[PDB]
Amino acid sequence: KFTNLEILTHLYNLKAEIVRRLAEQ
Amino acid sequence: PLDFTQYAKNMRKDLSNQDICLEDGALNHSYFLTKKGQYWTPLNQKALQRGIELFGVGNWKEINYDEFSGKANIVELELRTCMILGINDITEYYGKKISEEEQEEIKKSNIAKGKKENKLKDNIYQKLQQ
Amino acid sequence: DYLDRLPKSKKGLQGLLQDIEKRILHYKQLFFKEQNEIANGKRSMVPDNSIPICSDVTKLNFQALIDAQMRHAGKMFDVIMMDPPWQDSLSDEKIQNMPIQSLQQDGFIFVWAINAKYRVTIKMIENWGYKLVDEITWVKAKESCLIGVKGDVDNGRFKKNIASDVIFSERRGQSQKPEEIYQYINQLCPNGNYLEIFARRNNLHDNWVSIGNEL
Numbered sequence: 001k002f003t004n005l006e007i008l009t010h011l012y013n014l015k016a017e018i019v020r021r022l023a024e025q
Numbered sequence: 026p027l028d029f030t031q032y033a034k035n036m037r038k039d040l041s042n043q044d045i046c047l048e049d050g051a052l053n054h055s056y057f058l059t060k061k062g063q064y065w066t067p068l069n070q071k072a073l074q075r076g077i078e079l080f081g082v083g084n085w086k087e088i089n090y091d092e093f094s095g096k097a098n099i100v101e102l103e104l105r106t107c108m109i110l111g112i113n114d115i116t117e118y119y120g121k122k123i124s125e126e127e128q129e130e131i132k133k134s135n136i137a138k139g140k141k142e143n144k145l146k147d148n149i150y151q152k153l154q155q
Numbered sequence: 156d157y158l159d160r161l162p163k164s165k166k167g168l169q170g171l172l173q174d175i176e177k178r179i180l181h182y183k184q185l186f187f188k189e190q191n192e193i194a195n196g197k198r199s200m201v202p203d204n205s206i207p208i209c210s211d212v213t214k215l216n217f218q219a220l221i222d223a224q225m226r227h228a229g230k231m232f233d234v235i236m237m238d239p240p241w242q243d244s245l246s247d248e249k250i251q252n253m254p255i256q257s258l259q260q261d262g263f264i265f266v267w268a269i270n271a272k273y274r275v276t277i278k279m280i281e282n283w284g285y286k287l288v289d290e291i292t293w294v295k296a297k298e299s300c301l302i303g304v305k306g307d308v309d310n311g312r313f314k315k316n317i318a319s320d321v322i323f324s325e326r327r328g329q330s331q332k333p334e335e336i337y338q339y340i341n342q343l344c345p346n347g348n349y350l351e352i353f354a355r356r357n358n359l360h361d362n363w364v365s366i367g368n369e370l
């Protein structure tokens with residue numbers, strides 16, 4: 001099971017990847 | 026005649042790591058409430074506060090560099106400062122080099138700011154509500 | 156990340172970014188409330204008398220323990236328990252090399268062995284000077300805990316009629332070692348100093364020196 005930190009890490013990294021595809025457009 | 030409560034502290038001082046026992050010798054339960062390798066030492070909280078004066082609020086990449094030699098979590102910085110500024114969203118404070126003495130004022134002013142509008146939880150003012 | 160389960164349309168990507176923002180606010184307040192509780196100041200599941208040591212047994216100097224042991228207990232250990240990471244993993248030899256002869260003068264051993272390294276343990280601990288005695292068998296599927304003894308257990312310290320050798324899983328489909336064995340010891344040595352090598356935070360019981368890279 002994840003911790004609160006690990007979840008926030010995935011969420012930020014995810015946010016960066018999507019912001020990258022939103023900017024790629 | 027072997028006292029185990031004294032034998033325990035007396036061992037923990039000489040063998041256990043500095044994070045596991047207080048110089049007191051008693052057990053540091055804060056260390057076991059965080060997974061192995063994600064504990065936040067107090068030498069790390071002072072390292073962060075120091076980084077805010079030299080590199081500002083926004084540059085986590087640069088701070089992790091100097092104070093944590095590239096080993097700390099950018100997002101754990103990003104959050105631990107919210108607790109320093111007692112606010113859930115720190116977009117406003119991006120890029121401001123903040124002195125350690127200005128941080129407590131900014132915290133106290135945001136806690137009290139939070140307390141007044143009943144927009145405060147967990148010593149943190151939630152300026153972003155969902 | 157993953158790249159193939161992610162959306163590629165604008166409508167799909169904006170929608171996902173909107174839901175992540177909401178979710179970061181959620182796990183933010185859960186992390187502030189967690190840290191504040193821990194901060195002021197929560198209690199862990201660890202008993203107060205436990206004695207954790209995070210170290211690598213290859214790198215660790217056992218003499219530092221030996222000396223600080225004599226300094227405080229006035230005696231070497233009564234019972235030593237192991238769960239070697241057979242081959243995260245340690246070369247079968249490395250563990251073999253460990254100086255466990257230094258560490259205990261008179262008392263017992265408990266080594267956990269999988270069927271593949273069952274024979275190896277016997278001659279591993281006959282090297283350690285232990286005399287093979289008894290086997291505790293755990294039923295979940297089988298795992299065997301091998302027991303040995305050196306020197307003198309004639310002393311009144313130890314209790315010959317220890318608890319029944321067989322043991323069961325506290326839960327169903329469980330992988331951590333069961334707690335009952337720490338009471339088998341407690342019947343065999345009550346308030347005796349005990350060492351655990353390859354320990355884990357859920358192996359932290361009081362009266363026990365626990366050494367593990369994961370503590």
Ligand SMILES: Nc1ncnc2c1ncn2[C@@H]1O[C@H](CSCC[C@H](N)C(=O)O)[C@@H](O)[C@H]1O
Nearest residue numbers: 211212238240331332353355358367368369
């Ligand atoms: N050099 C080393 N020193 C100490 N521990 C080690 C090690 N190499 C591996 N280990 C650890 O030994 C443990 C083996 S698993 C132990 C599980 C234990 N039976 C329980 O569930 O309570 C793992 O934590 C592994 O990280």
